[PDB]
Design a protein around this nucleic acid. Structure first.
Ligand code: MG
Ligand code: MG
Ligand code: MG
Ligand code: MG
Ligand code: MG
Ligand code: MG
Ligand code: MG
Ligand code: MG
Ligand code: MG
Ligand code: MG
Ligand code: MG
Ligand code: MG
Ligand code: MG
Ligand code: MG
Ligand code: MG
Ligand code: MG
Ligand code: MG
Ligand code: MG
Ligand code: MG
Ligand code: MG
Ligand code: MG
Ligand code: MG
Ligand code: MG
Ligand code: MG
Ligand code: MG
Ligand code: MG
Ligand code: MG
Ligand code: MG
Ligand code: MG
Ligand code: MG
Ligand code: MG
Ligand code: MG
Ligand code: MG
Ligand code: MG
Ligand code: MG
Ligand code: MG
Ligand code: MG
Ligand code: MG
Ligand code: MG
Ligand code: MG
Ligand code: MG
Ligand code: MG
Ligand code: MG
Ligand code: MG
Ligand code: MG
Ligand code: ZN
Lengths: 50, 122, 86, 52
RNA sequence: CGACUCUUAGCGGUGGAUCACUCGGCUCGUGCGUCGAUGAAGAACGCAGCUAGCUGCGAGAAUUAAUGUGAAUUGCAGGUUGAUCAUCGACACUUCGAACGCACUUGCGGCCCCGGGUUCCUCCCGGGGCUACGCCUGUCUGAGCGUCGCU
RNA sequence: UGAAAAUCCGGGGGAGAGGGUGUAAAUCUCGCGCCGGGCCGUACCCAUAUCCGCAGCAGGUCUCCAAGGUGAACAGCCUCU
RNA sequence: CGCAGGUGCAGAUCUUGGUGGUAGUAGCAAAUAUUCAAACGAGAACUUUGAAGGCCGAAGUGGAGAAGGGUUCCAUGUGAACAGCAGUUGAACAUGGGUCAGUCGGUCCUGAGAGAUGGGCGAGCGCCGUUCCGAAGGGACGGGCGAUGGCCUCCGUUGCC
RNA sequence: AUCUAAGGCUAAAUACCGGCACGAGACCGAUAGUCAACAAGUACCGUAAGGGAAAGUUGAAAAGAACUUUGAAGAGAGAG
RNA sequence: CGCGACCUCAGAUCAGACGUGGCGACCCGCUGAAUUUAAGCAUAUUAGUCAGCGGAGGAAAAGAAACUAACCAGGAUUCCCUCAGUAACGGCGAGUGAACAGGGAAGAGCCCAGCGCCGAAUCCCCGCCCCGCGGCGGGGCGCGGGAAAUGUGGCGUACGGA
């Protein structure tokens, strides 16, 4: 599907900028209980909806 | 530099538009050095500028507006941004003169029979 | 051939994203949402599922006007005046 | 658009422009390629703005 | 003298029960009882020097003005004539949505008015303002040998 | 007995438009010269491993171009790119 | 000493977790096939180069596209996870890079059909219906008046008739 | 015997699992109590209408193990 | 065929105003079932209940008698105790089921039409000026314009009234 639309392209840009893991100081703060991002996503196991 | 809002309140209208047009250029010279790598001192200045442009767009829209609410003071028709914003049912309640109106019939049934005061013994 | 070997013939779509509810329930042929009823005027909600309201109510989002009405109320909706200038 | 860029780089950096080709990255920003007229220079305008 | 198998104890492993804590909930009760065409509820997309998330905000975007307080914020760098934290009464508030130029591809337009290539003269670009249905009192413009009669 | 419409053209008629005795008229459907054409999509897989079947599953899934030899031949057997 | 109770478990093909025997066993057998040497390397029955030997045999195990997927495409590093053995390799991980139009397409027309207004029903949110019980022309045209200004020549630009 | 239909207005005494702002409790104390004490109506399944979890605790202070050594590294051995 | 006027009726991007959708704990109007009980089951009951639909408010509705009782008579509505699980209905089976009086919380009452009299004694909007104007108002002026005799205001409503 390379005949897209723009509302779709913005939707497949947000779910692309929501994929990277945490910076290493983010679990350097004081009130941290976060060890890894648990909301990641791989394109073979799940299919995003749509 | 340190720029406050207690020295902008009576100056020229277009002087602040010029100093604004110089701070946007200066901010543009720091977006360039962010990508290409620059000093950490030339990186944290960008919060100073982004929060010292807004004190001008503020003092502008103020001194711009208290003249519109001075030119439309005594007039009966004034714009929607100016006539006072309260709630929906409070723009549509009856006004104070129309609440404090009585009839002629009641006003002549209060000339002769007011409410007296009194006290009885035991 | 009603199972596995007939799951290969699934490639087109019926539903797509709405623009009033935000969910994926905009039927294309009937042109009407299943979640919110878009070409209708009134928002579809029922009482038989008291769980499908609290997915979509007022206490959910931002309340970008109600939280500054819950603040202005306790001073009688003042306008106009200022704190004393010093 | 492709007009307001051509009218706002000539004004910022004091130069004229032959043509403009634009696209949108998958991050959602619009990259813009800008030609120049053969009377100005690219090396002589990079050193003015500091991308050198 | 061994090996396997069963039995109990000491030690060590797997496992996360018990005990002790608690910025959470449940029920009752008091006082108040406040939304939106001046554009609500909801959703979408954006914003941090190093940033993903919830959270906070809207091209002035992890907040501006004012007042009150009167010396910090902090994971790391930085640079008292009022920092930072609160209150909130002055400013601003991106796209969908009762949704409002006509559509839902974000596509096709119109009427005014300013800036520019220009030199109202057309087209040319840019900027701003208007162009939804329903109804109420008025003003304007009109139709009717079915009116209804005068001139 | 085998689709409609946008858009484009030719005739018939000649209102008079409208020209003036040439430095006329609109032409243009002849030869050149002069500026202008905005918005979005555009990489890659397209299947015995990038799709749906809980998965790198002997299944399923719409299309184009197709060499030499035997031979009736895109049949079946071998060989080049 | 008194008061109140969500107050005593072996089982319900009980509910939620957790671990054994069976067991280092069933099994890793569809479509004919692999050897020799070298290099980097801690390390090679699988990685790269070369040398042979073979298969698909033009309705292909080859070259390009649509539907769908959504960063898998490219490069450099990694080796604790995943690729049902291994792994220097990877559609895996981590950093970075990439998709340029007057002519290619969307946009523009109608088809089978969907769906508003006038109107009709209906307690009502709304429904049948699409030319049918409708005052449905907002526009050109040629001429005359009042306007303005454009180098008011030639005319624009509006109002009425 | 008792009332005047076919027309109209009117505060208090009463109700309140939603809402903002508050106090208390012979209650439960992480398989209990709301589904949810934590990035919960989130992750995730289904085309949809809708269904819907698991997950608390170092120590008073990170003072969260310098340096040596074997090992390609993981993990060790002394030390602290 | 004319200029004229009241009537009926349209159009406007005419001036100024308005409503439309959401929350839905409590509320008022309509619509409205079946499991279930009767040891079966069809009238009944389950129920004027869930679901469904439309409207509001800080509270809503009701309401100053076309009323109860037969007493030596009380005297608007709502709310609690009581009468009462009673008079009555009902394959008279299962089962449903009110009110008045009495004691108490709260206490508040009223206006129009008609009948008639005062010379439209009546409103709303535009104009100019002064005051105040973050709930758009008062007084002065308008040979300045509009609606109303198919009825605008005052007195006056069943306790009698003029
Ligand atoms: Mg798959
Ligand atoms: Mg279909
Ligand atoms: Mg509904
Ligand atoms: Mg970031
Ligand atoms: Mg301050
Ligand atoms: Mg389309
Ligand atoms: Mg001819
Ligand atoms: Mg491509
Ligand atoms: Mg047990
Ligand atoms: Mg074996
Ligand atoms: Mg073969
Ligand atoms: Mg291929
Ligand atoms: Mg290829
Ligand atoms: Mg690679
Ligand atoms: Mg085409
Ligand atoms: Mg219809
Ligand atoms: Mg009455
Ligand atoms: Mg107490
Ligand atoms: Mg207890
Ligand atoms: Mg627990
Ligand atoms: Mg729990
Ligand atoms: Mg526990
Ligand atoms: Mg736990
Ligand atoms: Mg613990
Ligand atoms: Mg208007
Ligand atoms: Mg019935
Ligand atoms: Mg029975
Ligand atoms: Mg029975
Ligand atoms: Mg039965
Ligand atoms: Mg009943
Ligand atoms: Mg019945
Ligand atoms: Mg009923
Ligand atoms: Mg109901
Ligand atoms: Mg409503
Ligand atoms: Mg309210
Ligand atoms: Mg009431
Ligand atoms: Mg009432
Ligand atoms: Mg009475
Ligand atoms: Mg009574
Ligand atoms: Mg009794
Ligand atoms: Mg019987
Ligand atoms: Mg009584
Ligand atoms: Mg009392
Ligand atoms: Mg009266
Ligand atoms: Mg009267
Ligand atoms: Zn929707």
């Amino acid at each position: 599907s390379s005949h897209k639309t723009f509302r779709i392209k913005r939707f497949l840009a947000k779910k692309q900028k929501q994929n990277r893991p945490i910076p290493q100081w983010i679990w350097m703060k004081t009130g941290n209980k976060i060890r890894y991002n648990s909301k990641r996503r791989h394109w073979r196991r799940t299919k995003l909806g749509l | 530099a340190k720029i406050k809002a207690r020295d902008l309140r009576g100056k020229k209208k277009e002087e602040l538009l010029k100093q604004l047009d110089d701070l946007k250029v200066e901010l543009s010279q720091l977006r360039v050095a962010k990508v290409t790598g620059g000093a950490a001192s030339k990186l944290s200045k960008i919060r100073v500028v982004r929060k010292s442009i807004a004190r001008v767009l503020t003092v502008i829209n103020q001194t711009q507006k208290e003249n519109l609410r001075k030119f439309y003071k005594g007039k009966k028709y004034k714009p929607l941004d100016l006539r006072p914003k309260k709630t929906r049912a409070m723009r549509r309640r009856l006004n104070k003169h129309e609440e404090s109106l009585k009839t002629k019939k009641q006003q002549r049934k209060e000339r002769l029979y007011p409410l007296r005061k009194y006290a009885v013994k035991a | 051939t009603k199972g596995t070997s007939s799951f290969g013939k699934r490639r087109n779509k019926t539903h797509t994203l709405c623009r009033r509810c935000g969910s994926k329930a905009y039927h294309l042929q009937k042109s009407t949402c299943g979640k919110c009823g878009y070409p209708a005027k009134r928002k579809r909600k029922y009482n038989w599922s008291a769980k499908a309201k609290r997915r979509n109510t007022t206490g959910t989002g931002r309340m970008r006007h109600l939280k500054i009405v819950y603040r202005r109320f306790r001073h009688g909706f003042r306008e106009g005046t200022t704190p004393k200038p010093k | 658009n492709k007009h307001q860029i051509k009218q706002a780089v000539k004004k910022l950096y004091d130069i004229d422009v032959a043509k403009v080709n634009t696209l949108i990255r998958p991050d959602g920003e619009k990259k813009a390629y800008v030609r120049l007229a053969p009377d100005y220079d690219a090396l002589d305008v990079a050193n003015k703005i500091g991308i050198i």
